[PDB]
C-alpha cells in the first residue's frame, strides 16, 4: 500500500469508532478522545504508564507515523488496556473500550475482506 492509500483505510477506521452509537445513542468514543487532566487526575498517570488518546491516534495518522494497520490497531489495544486497567470490570468505560475495540476489528475485516 502507498502511504496515502494507507491513510485512507486508518481515517475509516477512526471514523468508524468515532461515529459508533449504543442504542440509547451515547457516543461510545467521547470519554476516550483526549487523556484525563494530569491535574486532576493524577493517579491516572502514576498507573497508566504509556497513556495514549483518540486525538493521539488521529495525529499519527496525519503524521503518516503508523506503517501498517496493525501498528494502529496496537495503538487502539493499547488505550482500550488502559482504560480497563484504570477501571473497574463492567464499569462503563470498562464496557465502551471493549466495544471500541469490537468496532474497530469488524471494521478492519470489513474493509481488508471485502472482494
Ligand atoms: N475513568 C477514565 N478512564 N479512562 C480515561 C481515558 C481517557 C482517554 C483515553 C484513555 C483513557 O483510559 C478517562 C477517564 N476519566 C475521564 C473523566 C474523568 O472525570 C474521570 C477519568
Ligand atoms: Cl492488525
Ligand atoms: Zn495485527
Ligand atoms: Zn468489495
Known amino acids: 500500500?502507498?502511504?496515502?492509500?494507507?491513510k485512507e483505510?486508518?481515517?475509516?477506521?477512526?471514523?468508524?469508532?468515532?461515529?459508533?452509537?449504543?442504542?440509547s445513542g451515547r457516543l461510545i468514543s467521547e470519554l476516550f478522545q483526549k487523556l484525563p487532566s494530569?491535574?486532576?487526575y493524577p493517579d491516572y498517570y502514576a498507573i497508566i504508564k504509556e497513556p495514549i488518546d483518540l486525538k493521539?491516534?488521529?495525529?499519527?495518522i496525519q503524521n503518516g507515523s503508523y506503517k501498517s494497520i496493525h501498528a494502529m490497531a496496537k495503538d487502539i489495544?493499547?488505550?482500550?488496556?488502559?482504560?480497563?486497567?484504570?477501571?473497574?470490570?463492567?464499569?462503563?468505560?470498562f464496557?465502551?473500550?471493549?466495544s471500541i475495540?469490537?468496532?474497530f476489528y469488524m471494521?478492519?475485516?470489513?474493509?481488508?475482506?471485502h472482494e
Open 1 to 6: 500500500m502507498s502511504p496515502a492509500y494507507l
Open 9 to 23: 483505510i486508518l481515517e475509516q477506521l477512526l471514523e468508524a469508532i468515532v461515529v459508533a452509537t449504543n442504542p
Open 38 to 40: 494530569k491535574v486532576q
Open 56 to 60: 493521539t491516534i488521529a495525529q499519527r
Open 77 to 93: 489495544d493499547l488505550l482500550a488496556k488502559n482504560a480497563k486497567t484504570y477501571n473497574e470490570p463492567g464499569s462503563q468505560v
Open 95 to 98: 464496557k465502551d473500550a471493549n
Open 101 to 103: 475495540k469490537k468496532i
Open 107 to 113: 471494521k478492519k475485516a470489513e474493509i481488508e475482506h
